[PDB]
Design a protein around this ligand. Structure first.
Ligand code: 3H3
Ligand code: MG
Ligand code: MG
Ligand code: MG
Ligand code: MG
Ligand code: MG
Ligand code: MG
Ligand code: MG
Ligand code: MG
Ligand code: MG
Ligand code: MG
Ligand code: MG
Ligand code: MG
Ligand code: MG
Ligand code: MG
Ligand code: MG
Ligand code: MG
Ligand code: MG
Ligand code: MG
Ligand code: MG
Ligand code: MG
Ligand code: MG
Ligand code: MG
Ligand code: MG
Ligand code: MG
Ligand code: MG
Ligand code: MG
Ligand code: MG
Ligand code: MG
Ligand code: MG
Ligand code: MG
Ligand code: MG
Ligand code: MG
Ligand code: MG
Ligand code: MG
Ligand code: MG
Ligand code: MG
Ligand code: MG
Ligand code: MG
Ligand code: MG
Ligand code: MG
Ligand code: MG
Ligand code: MG
Ligand code: MG
Ligand code: MG
Ligand code: MG
Ligand code: MG
Ligand code: MG
Ligand code: MG
Ligand code: MG
Ligand code: MG
Ligand code: MG
Ligand code: MG
Ligand code: MG
Ligand code: MG
Ligand code: MG
Ligand code: MG
Ligand code: MG
Ligand code: MG
Ligand code: MG
Ligand code: MG
Ligand code: MG
Ligand code: MG
Ligand code: MG
Ligand code: MG
Ligand code: MG
Ligand code: MG
Ligand code: MG
Ligand code: MG
Ligand code: MG
Ligand code: MG
Ligand code: MG
Ligand code: MG
Ligand code: MG
Ligand code: MG
Ligand code: MG
Ligand code: MG
Ligand code: MG
Ligand code: MG
Ligand code: MG
Ligand code: MG
Ligand code: MG
Ligand code: MG
Ligand code: MG
Ligand code: MG
Ligand code: MG
Ligand code: MG
Ligand code: MG
Ligand code: MG
Ligand code: MG
Ligand code: MG
Ligand code: MG
Ligand code: MG
Ligand code: MG
Ligand code: MG
Ligand code: MG
Ligand code: MG
Ligand code: MG
Ligand code: MG
Ligand code: MG
Ligand code: MG
Ligand code: MG
Ligand code: MG
Ligand code: MG
Ligand code: MG
Ligand code: MG
Ligand code: MG
Ligand code: MG
Ligand code: MG
Ligand code: MG
Ligand code: MG
Ligand code: MG
Ligand code: MG
Ligand code: MG
Ligand code: MG
Ligand code: MG
Ligand code: MG
Ligand code: MG
Ligand code: MG
Ligand code: MG
Ligand code: MG
Ligand code: MG
Ligand code: MG
Ligand code: MG
Ligand code: MG
Ligand code: MG
Ligand code: MG
Ligand code: MG
Ligand code: MG
Ligand code: MG
Ligand code: MG
Ligand code: MG
Ligand code: MG
Lengths: 58, 159, 99, 105
RNA sequence: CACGGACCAAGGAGUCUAACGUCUAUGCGAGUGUUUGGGUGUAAAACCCAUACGCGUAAUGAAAGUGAACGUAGGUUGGGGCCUCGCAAGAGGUGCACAAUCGACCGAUCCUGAUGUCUUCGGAUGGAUUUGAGUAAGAGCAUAGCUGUUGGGACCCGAAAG
RNA sequence: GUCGAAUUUGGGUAUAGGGGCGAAAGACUAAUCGAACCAUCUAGUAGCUGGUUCCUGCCGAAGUUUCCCUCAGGAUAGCAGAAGCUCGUAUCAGUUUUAUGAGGUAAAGCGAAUGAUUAGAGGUUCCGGGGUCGAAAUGACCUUGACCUAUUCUCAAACUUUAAAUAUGUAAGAAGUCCUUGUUACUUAAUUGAACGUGGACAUUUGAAUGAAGAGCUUUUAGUGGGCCAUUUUUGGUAAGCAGAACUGGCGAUGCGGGAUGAACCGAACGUAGAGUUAAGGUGCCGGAAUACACGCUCAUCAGACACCACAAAAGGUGUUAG
RNA sequence: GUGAUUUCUGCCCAGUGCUCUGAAUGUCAAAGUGAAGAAAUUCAACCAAGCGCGGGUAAACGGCGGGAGUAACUAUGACU
RNA sequence: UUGACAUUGUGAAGAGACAUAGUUUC
RNA sequence: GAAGACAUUGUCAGGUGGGGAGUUUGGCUGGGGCGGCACAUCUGUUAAACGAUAACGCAGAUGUCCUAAGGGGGGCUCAUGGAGAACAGAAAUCUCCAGUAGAACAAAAGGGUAAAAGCCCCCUUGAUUUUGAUUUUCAGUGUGAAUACAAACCAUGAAAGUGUGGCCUAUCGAUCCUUUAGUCCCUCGGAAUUUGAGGCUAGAGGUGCCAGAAAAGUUACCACAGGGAUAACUGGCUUGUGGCAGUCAAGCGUUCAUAGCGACAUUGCUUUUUGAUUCUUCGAUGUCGGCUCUUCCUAUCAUACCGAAGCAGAAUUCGGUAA
RNA sequence: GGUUGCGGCCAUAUCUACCAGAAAGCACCGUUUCCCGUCCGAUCAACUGUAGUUAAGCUGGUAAGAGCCUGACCGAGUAGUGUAGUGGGUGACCAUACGCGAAACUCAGGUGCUGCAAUCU
């Protein structure tokens, strides 16, 4: 008893109903997978400049 | 049965370009990448470490990380009906700065200028691009150039 | 028989459980019955109260030992100290616990 | 494959915590005691009637085993395991490959 | 040129229950739930109630255990609405919910190991591409309904068998 | 067939269901036997077969992905409904343009590499073999081989320097561009850089086109998980109304006009109706609609007559036509 | 098991079975023995029948070869 | 089927140990 | 009288035990079975120049092998060919020239590589330690394999550097359980010490039907739920094979291609061969042959009339109208 | 302009055969005590810059040179291809419509450009 094995028939019809949604985009993306040595430093850098602003609001 | 390893189907893709084998020229290593840069991806077959998978050949993405011998590139790949974010660790040998952007950067830098050149003068700018327009009228002269009359030519064999 | 994102459940209904279903339809009846029992016993029991003097006692275990609670009966020492014997204590409506 | 009987490699015991000389040897399973809870649960399960009460594997396919190296730091005494690719012939005794010699007689 | 069905009446198949997911309505709300039981009655109703208990208000570890503010309970970007100016268009101020991102807090893991000590107990403090169904001015508890889930004769009728 | 005995036969009596009894057939054990009958466990289980009861309104599928003792079944994703929720000129796009990449198919190529392949021509042997001269020769001369040089005819799914068309990644700004100069434990020879910032400057021709019954987002759940067909690309097969892929469009789930007929072709997609005009297809009669106009061709003692489509070939004619 | 009479009933005990006045230092249970241990326990020795070894057995189940050569034509092959 | 334990007692001879008095075991 | 603490019996222990019980006895598949593995994979092609993509498609390969064939460093240049040197020959060893790789790099194949990734030498264990992120397969789960960083500790080199196994693309494995390594850490719940046991972290023992059951046959004595998702039989597409008929004309035929024939080629037709397919029928359309009986086709065996002949006559052969 | 050291693009730089090259540079070149490496001071190491030379390296020029590079209505709007028809044809295939559009070929032109630093009649 054999049957069809494979086809893409009708698959792009299905993907286009709800649509192929474009990637979606953020200002400030995640630092996921960014160099730890960088991030460690970036963390103190930021801390530093925050301080220097809250200070400038003494 | 079937076969679908990593570098499957890539015979001509990662192949090396006629009379261009060997050491990669040093300019490939002197180039410099910063997070945010736009890069095109294309595999140097002679550089097995740090290779893009063949799906990403011909593809263009953005740098998100700079590493000792590499850059991390984010490519948007569509699976099913949606894109997912992909992150690539590529050695600098498999990447170049895309010029997909120069026409923009060059156009911006220029757009500022003729805006200054207008304003300062007393406006009237118009600096959006425009499609090819149809042609205007014109008068073609016959002088030195009377029209040659051609006709269709008979059937003939040569052989 | 497993689908969707649902919690895994444990409904023990794999025996002939429909043969052991007690529905308390007789909740009202029993209450009434229990009330009549008390009215009856009160009457038989002349002027005595329906219950016995139970002792105070500190509840067991770290969890309830903060609270104090009715105990079974008084203890031979208690009874003695309150100036009575237990045989008599028992007839005078007081509960006595040798344990 | 033949591997050396000694190995300068990383020793991760509180006081060594550096590359030290290790003696290399090959792991052998170890006798099974009754009184492991498994054997205990199994012996109870198997008593009385009702025959074999637990599956018994037959459909064997592999013809090798991954070799494991016991590695003992001669200083701090401590041992590390290290497991090798599937091979069919293993030794750690010597006999190194040799330069460019004739085939004998 | 597959099956059922000559005809007609009458019967004739997604149900109820335990425990659930989402959604919604209602009561109350850091709580909530009178109905095991007691009280009471015009008597299985309606009305009333003490102590517990259950879920929630804390998490994280296999465990012993430990246990949620550097700060206006943080910074950044967007943000309805409101506020201020303006005739208006607009500008600025504030920005709940929600979203993205970077931090801080609690537990686990790893590291650091102060003042001290029944000299091996003690574990302050500052940390780490680690890790949690967490904190960060609570949202739950209950009743009820549609739909869906598992156990049940389980939509109804049907084995050869044991 | 046998008919005086291993004969026929009444009644009584024994053997009972994994049991009996068997001159043995799996026979017989009350029309029941390769395990009797009765009741109960029991509404046994069923991925299988059958059926599943009122109307109208709106929306509207799948036969694909992945895993499964999986292949007539599930789970998972997709497709579908419902509920909405947060916002709104906003952001959006099965499209174009512009700019900038990727690719090795079609074609092409072979007096370019690899591999095949037809033919000569001219070379080269102390050196592959024959043969004449020879005492031989690293001798001479013919001879046929290979090899070399420049030519020559022909080829490739698993060959190629070149190399399309169609298809395909990214970009076309306020999340932008420029000036000033703060933070750090990273990094530099270095206040050097890198990343994140403060303060300042420029508004809708702010940075192509076209469109936008808006855009984003969340939960949950049905059916489905046999598919089949046509144009084009295309594998296996002599071939198939055969078996298997690719992209789209359809049929399945869909009536309506045409193709007489017909799931899939052509036209065209449906609320109840009037008037009009068309599609595809027709207009001698059947049959609504010119036995219309116009130039040719064709005469068949088995003419011909409309795509899909319901078949005809090599070959041949001093029939006729035009060249 | 075979199946009246008559006649005959060959060779094979390696295998599977069956069977035995066999042998024995190989294997081998519970109890009992010994050693270690604080004990739980661990190890050892001894050790029944059986198994293994040796013998018997086909009117037990069953079995009962293959390749070359060779005689005065050829063929055949007593013979190797 | 084979072993051990229990049913299981009494003598005698012979082996076996505290290591060549008899409690004990074959 | 016999027999005698032995038999017997009771309880455990080993042997034996189809007499009996219970159960099992893969999947894909042009039906099923035998086979093979398209069942977990790798290279090239099919594949239609991004990616994806099927068939029991095509040509192959995988369950390994390596203490160096891993790591670092220096030096060097390979296949082949020419011309040269006692014994020495086609092939021994020595030299120079040419040499884009025509070699070599475990292995299939593809890619890659020349002061190297090949060959020779020198030093070595980074094939190590911790725990995350990422790419392929994808559900964006797992597993395999791989990438780029962080934090250690080392190797090598004058150094920049390189090194987290083998130049790249394959070379493999859950839960339970056992076992080992780890810290000397948690628990054993009335309190302790010590054995024992149990937890935590990371490995090994393996599932090849490779997301991973513990598994022999027979049924013609057979049984059930289904299947026209599926074979055997009519019928349908096909026409390789079978059968039948042509075209060309080298030959056959004393001479002479075509009276009668006909090679090498090549165009067809037929559906009483056989295959190929699997559309319809498995809740039934009862096989083969014969008997009987009707009707039809023509590719005509006889009978009517003809044209040919290597037709003298007789006989025959070829052809036409003819069923 | 030459030359050298370090280079970028990596043949317009390569290959074959000739010839020309001042000045400096580079080179060839002399040596073997010392570090160092070899069967061999050929390479590699050191020492002299003295003793010698443009022969070679190097650089440049020549050639109806081989190769390579660039261009063209040279071939060719050809081959191929996206879209269309109830177009032709038994078929194999082929025309047409709206677009995109090669490779070979042929001919012409060319044969390294250039950055940093030091040096030179
Ligand atoms: C196969 C075995 C070990 C495997 C590594 C393994 O993990 C098996 C696994 O434990 C099976 C369990 C898993 C589970 O979750 N539940 C189960 O019930 C079964 C054992 O085999 C052998 O080691 C040798 C085996 C050689 C042959 C002889 C014996 C096999 C025994 C072992 C079954
Ligand atoms: Mg099937
Ligand atoms: Mg089929
Ligand atoms: Mg299917
Ligand atoms: Mg393949
Ligand atoms: Mg590697
Ligand atoms: Mg219950
Ligand atoms: Mg049950
Ligand atoms: Mg009752
Ligand atoms: Mg009371
Ligand atoms: Mg027990
Ligand atoms: Mg230790
Ligand atoms: Mg029909
Ligand atoms: Mg049916
Ligand atoms: Mg009927
Ligand atoms: Mg009715
Ligand atoms: Mg009242
Ligand atoms: Mg009452
Ligand atoms: Mg009370
Ligand atoms: Mg706790
Ligand atoms: Mg503690
Ligand atoms: Mg910030
Ligand atoms: Mg504002
Ligand atoms: Mg603000
Ligand atoms: Mg913390
Ligand atoms: Mg943890
Ligand atoms: Mg929780
Ligand atoms: Mg909770
Ligand atoms: Mg149900
Ligand atoms: Mg039944
Ligand atoms: Mg029954
Ligand atoms: Mg059963
Ligand atoms: Mg029986
Ligand atoms: Mg029975
Ligand atoms: Mg019985
Ligand atoms: Mg029989
Ligand atoms: Mg009956
Ligand atoms: Mg039922
Ligand atoms: Mg039933
Ligand atoms: Mg099924
Ligand atoms: Mg609709
Ligand atoms: Mg399985
Ligand atoms: Mg399926
Ligand atoms: Mg069905
Ligand atoms: Mg290709
Ligand atoms: Mg090709
Ligand atoms: Mg081609
Ligand atoms: Mg061609
Ligand atoms: Mg070409
Ligand atoms: Mg060629
Ligand atoms: Mg030519
Ligand atoms: Mg596009
Ligand atoms: Mg696009
Ligand atoms: Mg608009
Ligand atoms: Mg709108
Ligand atoms: Mg759904
Ligand atoms: Mg679904
Ligand atoms: Mg589903
Ligand atoms: Mg189905
Ligand atoms: Mg169509
Ligand atoms: Mg259907
Ligand atoms: Mg339609
Ligand atoms: Mg008519
Ligand atoms: Mg009419
Ligand atoms: Mg046509
Ligand atoms: Mg028709
Ligand atoms: Mg004519
Ligand atoms: Mg017999
Ligand atoms: Mg007989
Ligand atoms: Mg007899
Ligand atoms: Mg005889
Ligand atoms: Mg004999
Ligand atoms: Mg025998
Ligand atoms: Mg024993
Ligand atoms: Mg035999
Ligand atoms: Mg005895
Ligand atoms: Mg006895
Ligand atoms: Mg007995
Ligand atoms: Mg038996
Ligand atoms: Mg049986
Ligand atoms: Mg099968
Ligand atoms: Mg099957
Ligand atoms: Mg078959
Ligand atoms: Mg098979
Ligand atoms: Mg398949
Ligand atoms: Mg499989
Ligand atoms: Mg693999
Ligand atoms: Mg592709
Ligand atoms: Mg895919
Ligand atoms: Mg290779
Ligand atoms: Mg080099
Ligand atoms: Mg290893
Ligand atoms: Mg999983
Ligand atoms: Mg993995
Ligand atoms: Mg190597
Ligand atoms: Mg594998
Ligand atoms: Mg341990
Ligand atoms: Mg303890
Ligand atoms: Mg405790
Ligand atoms: Mg206890
Ligand atoms: Mg302890
Ligand atoms: Mg212990
Ligand atoms: Mg499987
Ligand atoms: Mg599987
Ligand atoms: Mg099995
Ligand atoms: Mg059976
Ligand atoms: Mg069928
Ligand atoms: Mg035929
Ligand atoms: Mg035929
Ligand atoms: Mg034929
Ligand atoms: Mg026939
Ligand atoms: Mg001829
Ligand atoms: Mg003639
Ligand atoms: Mg002739
Ligand atoms: Mg059929
Ligand atoms: Mg049938
Ligand atoms: Mg039927
Ligand atoms: Mg019938
Ligand atoms: Mg009939
Ligand atoms: Mg005829
Ligand atoms: Mg005639
Ligand atoms: Mg004649
Ligand atoms: Mg007739
Ligand atoms: Mg007729
Ligand atoms: Mg000079
Ligand atoms: Mg010397
Ligand atoms: Mg010298
Ligand atoms: Mg030197
Ligand atoms: Mg000169
Ligand atoms: Mg030079
Ligand atoms: Mg030239
Ligand atoms: Mg075309
Ligand atoms: Mg057409």
């Amino acid at each position: 008893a054999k049957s069809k094995n494979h086809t893409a028939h009708n698959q792009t019809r299905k993907a286009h109903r709800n649509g192929i949604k474009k990637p979606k985009t953020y200002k400030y993306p995640s630092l996921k997978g960014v160099d730890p040595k960088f991030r460690r430093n970036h963390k103190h850098a930021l801390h530093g400049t925050a301080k220097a602003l809250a200070a400038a609001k003494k | 049965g079937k076969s679908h390893g990593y570098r499957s189907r890539t015979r001509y893709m990662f192949q090396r370009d006629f009379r261009k084998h060997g050491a990669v020229h040093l300019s490939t290593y002197l180039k410099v990448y910063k997070v945010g840069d736009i890069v095109d991806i294309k595999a140097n077959g002679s550089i097995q470490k740090g290779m893009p998978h063949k799906f990403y050949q011909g593809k263009t993405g953005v740098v998100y990380n700079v590493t000792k011998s590499s850059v991390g590139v984010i490519i948007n790949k569509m699976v099913g009906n949606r894109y997912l974010e992909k992150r690539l660790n590529l050695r600098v040998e498999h990447i170049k700065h895309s010029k997909c952007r120069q026409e923009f950067l060059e156009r911006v830098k220029a757009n500022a200028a003729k805006r200054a050149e207008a304003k300062a003068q007393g406006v009237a700018v118009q600096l959006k691009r425009q499609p090819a327009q149809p042609r205007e009228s014109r008068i073609v002269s016959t002088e030195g150039n009377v029209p040659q009359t051609l006709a269709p030519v008979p059937y003939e064999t040569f052989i | 028989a497993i689908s969707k994102n649902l919690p895994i459940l444990k409904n023990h209904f794999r025996k002939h459980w429909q043969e052991r279903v007690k529905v308390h339809f007789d909740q009202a009846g029993k209450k009434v019955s229990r009330r009549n029992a008390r009215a009856t016993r009160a009457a038989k029991i002349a002027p005595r109260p329906l219950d016995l003097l139970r002792p105070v006692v500190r509840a067991p275990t770290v969890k309830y030992n903060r609270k104090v609670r009715a105990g079974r009966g008084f203890t031979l020492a208690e009874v003695k100290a309150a100036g009575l014997t237990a045989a008599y204590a028992r007839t005078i409506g007081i509960a006595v616990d040798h344990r | 494959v033949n591997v050396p009987k000694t190995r300068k490699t990383y020793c991760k015991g509180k006081t060594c915590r550096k590359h030290t000389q290790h003696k290399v040897t090959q792991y052998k399973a170890g006798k099974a005691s009754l009184f492991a809870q498994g054997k205990r649960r199994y012996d109870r399960k198997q008593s009385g009637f009702g025959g074999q009460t637990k599956p018994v594997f037959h459909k064997k396919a592999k013809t090798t085993k991954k070799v494991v190296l016991r590695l003992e730091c001669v200083k701090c005494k401590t041992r590390a395991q290290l497991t090798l690719k599937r091979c069919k012939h293993f030794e750690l005794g010597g006999e190194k490959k040799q330069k460019g010699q004739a085939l004998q007689f």
